[PDB]
Design an enzyme around this catalytic site. Sequence first.
Site, PDB file in Angstrom:
ATOM      1  N   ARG B  69       0.790  -1.243   0.000  1.00 32.06           N
ATOM      2  CA  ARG B  69       0.000   0.000   0.000  1.00 32.06           C
ATOM      3  C   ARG B  69       0.825   1.297   0.000  1.00 32.06           C
ATOM      4  O   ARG B  69       0.328   2.346  -0.414  1.00 32.06           O
ATOM      5  CB  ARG B  69      -1.010   0.001   1.148  1.00 32.06           C
ATOM      6  CG  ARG B  69      -2.319  -0.680   0.784  1.00 32.06           C
ATOM      7  CD  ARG B  69      -3.278  -0.721   1.962  1.00 32.06           C
ATOM      8  NE  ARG B  69      -3.217  -1.988   2.706  1.00 32.06           N
ATOM      9  CZ  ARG B  69      -3.567  -2.152   3.984  1.00 32.06           C
ATOM     10  NH1 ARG B  69      -3.971  -1.130   4.743  1.00 32.06           N
ATOM     11  NH2 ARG B  69      -3.487  -3.363   4.524  1.00 32.06           N
ATOM     12  N   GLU B 106       2.358 -12.473  13.094  1.00 33.84           N
ATOM     13  CA  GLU B 106       1.522 -13.037  14.164  1.00 33.84           C
ATOM     14  C   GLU B 106       1.983 -14.449  14.530  1.00 33.84           C
ATOM     15  O   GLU B 106       2.378 -14.692  15.674  1.00 33.84           O
ATOM     16  CB  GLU B 106       0.034 -13.025  13.779  1.00 33.84           C
ATOM     17  CG  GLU B 106      -0.903 -13.372  14.936  1.00 33.84           C
ATOM     18  CD  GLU B 106      -2.373 -13.412  14.547  1.00 33.84           C
ATOM     19  OE1 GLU B 106      -2.764 -12.749  13.561  1.00 33.84           O
ATOM     20  OE2 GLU B 106      -3.146 -14.106  15.245  1.00 33.84           O
TER      21      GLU B 106
HETATM   22  O1  LIG Z   1       3.300  -1.844  11.563  1.00 39.10           O
HETATM   23  P1  LIG Z   1       3.199  -3.277  11.107  1.00 39.10           P
HETATM   24  O2  LIG Z   1       4.554  -3.860  10.806  1.00 39.10           O
HETATM   25  O3  LIG Z   1       2.511  -4.099  12.171  1.00 39.10           O
HETATM   26  O4  LIG Z   1       2.290  -3.325   9.788  1.00 39.10           O
HETATM   27  C1  LIG Z   1       2.530  -2.436   8.708  1.00 39.10           C
HETATM   28  C2  LIG Z   1       1.294  -2.456   7.819  1.00 39.10           C
HETATM   29  N1  LIG Z   1       1.023  -3.819   7.292  1.00 39.10           N
HETATM   30  C3  LIG Z   1       0.489  -3.636   5.924  1.00 39.10           C
HETATM   31  C4  LIG Z   1      -0.769  -4.443   5.714  1.00 39.10           C
HETATM   32  O5  LIG Z   1      -0.529  -5.767   6.175  1.00 39.10           O
HETATM   33  P2  LIG Z   1      -0.832  -7.030   5.241  1.00 39.10           P
HETATM   34  O6  LIG Z   1      -2.001  -6.718   4.324  1.00 39.10           O
HETATM   35  O7  LIG Z   1       0.413  -7.305   4.429  1.00 39.10           O
HETATM   36  O8  LIG Z   1      -1.160  -8.186   6.157  1.00 39.10           O
HETATM   37  C5  LIG Z   1       0.245  -2.146   5.769  1.00 39.10           C
HETATM   38  O9  LIG Z   1       0.222  -1.735   4.400  1.00 39.10           O
HETATM   39  C6  LIG Z   1       1.386  -1.584   6.581  1.00 39.10           C
HETATM   40  O10 LIG Z   1       2.639  -1.784   5.923  1.00 39.10           O
HETATM   41  N1  LIG Z   2      -6.273  -1.335  11.586  1.00 38.69           N
HETATM   42  C1  LIG Z   2      -5.646  -1.345  10.387  1.00 38.69           C
HETATM   43  N2  LIG Z   2      -6.182  -0.720   9.306  1.00 38.69           N
HETATM   44  C2  LIG Z   2      -5.565  -0.723   8.102  1.00 38.69           C
HETATM   45  N3  LIG Z   2      -4.382  -1.338   7.885  1.00 38.69           N
HETATM   46  C3  LIG Z   2      -3.728  -2.001   8.879  1.00 38.69           C
HETATM   47  N4  LIG Z   2      -2.581  -2.682   8.975  1.00 38.69           N
HETATM   48  C4  LIG Z   2      -2.445  -3.130  10.251  1.00 38.69           C
HETATM   49  N5  LIG Z   2      -3.506  -2.744  11.004  1.00 38.69           N
HETATM   50  C5  LIG Z   2      -4.342  -2.041  10.218  1.00 38.69           C
END
Ligand SMILES: O=P(O)(O)OC[C@@H]1N[C@@H](COP(=O)(O)O)[C@@H](O)[C@H]1O
Ligand SMILES: Nc1ncnc2[nH]cnc12
Lengths: 172, 179
Positions: B69, B106
Amino acid sequence: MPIASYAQELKLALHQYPNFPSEGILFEDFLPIFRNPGLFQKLIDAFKLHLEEAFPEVKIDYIVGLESRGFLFGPTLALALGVGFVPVRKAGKLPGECFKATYLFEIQKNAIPAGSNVIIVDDIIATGGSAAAAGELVEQLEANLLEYNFVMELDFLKGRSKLNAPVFTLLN
Amino acid sequence: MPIASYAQELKLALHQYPNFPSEGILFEDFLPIFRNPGLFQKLIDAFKLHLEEAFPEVKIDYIVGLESRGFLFGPTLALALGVGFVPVRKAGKLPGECFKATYEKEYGSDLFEIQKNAIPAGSNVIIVDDIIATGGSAAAAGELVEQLEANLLEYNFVMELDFLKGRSKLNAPVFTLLN
Ligand SMILES: O=P(O)(O)OC[C@@H]1N[C@@H](COP(=O)(O)O)[C@@H](O)[C@H]1O
Ligand SMILES: Nc1ncnc2[nH]cnc12
Ligand SMILES: O=P(O)(O)OC[C@@H]1N[C@@H](COP(=O)(O)O)[C@@H](O)[C@H]1O
């Protein structure tokens, strides 16, 4: 032609990586275009000029970009054109009610109204399955697919045969 | 101030999705900003104005955007600034020689990467991503910028989940546009 000169310079910027991701596969890396704002601007302008040429009196409402490398230029092309961007994502990444297309890809039901004119964008077309899925999602939106726009195309795989709408590939 | 008016209008454009991806999690969907070129331009301009404010006589060499994203706005911000974009990707997606940085989700210790040839040593860099949650992904990106011997001027986020304390895992200063 402005498009050809930019296409040649962008072709030179590509970096070839033998045997990635696995043995036999030749990876065309377009990421060097994005580190150079001059090259990046040329890629965006090349697509912009082509859409202006192909669709001079047809308003594009959205660019639809495929996850994940279509995201690198699709949104920027959208903003250059003064149009919306909407992602087609892998399964389970988009929140809310989505349409589904098997390759699994998804698009948000509320993203694009019916009758919107759309261009689908992605870095590369290989087998065509991912692009075809995006087309099925544009169809479930009841939106119009004007064209597919790709940076690269692997002609030997015949990806465009899976697709209905016209295809443009910038770097042949 | 321009930043604040744009931040308020962008906050209104966000769509809340209860219990996605699973029970208890509140998903902040910023995708409605991208369907509206007016809103999208405001997001880019907001970040641009903030970087101009924070770093008036410091040249930014690159925006580093996290997959996936961060890719939605990072490259566009890069081009607006007249600077390079470089992605930080998930494991095994970038070709060529890469640096590696570990992060946990996780039930997993996954992995981020950056291309060794992408950014010279001593380059000034801004890392961008949509949201900071636990901070692990941002911290990994920072480790990759460090292995480049590049300078991390700031982290720039659209959203931040303050209750998770993601900021605490990070060394460089953090800016979040929508608090
Ligand atoms: O701050 P953390 O490492 O817990 O997560 C970052 C977010 N995780 C992505 C979404 O997680 P995913 O869709 O890959 O499970 C967001 O775009 C952000 O990069
Ligand atoms: N609450 C949240 N909303 C959108 N993106 C996320 N990535 C991790 N937590 C989230
Ligand atoms: O044309 P197909 O469906 O075979 O592949 C499309 C490409 N697949 C992506 C790379 O594969 P991935 O990294 O998602 O496994 C490219 O960005 C393009 O979307």
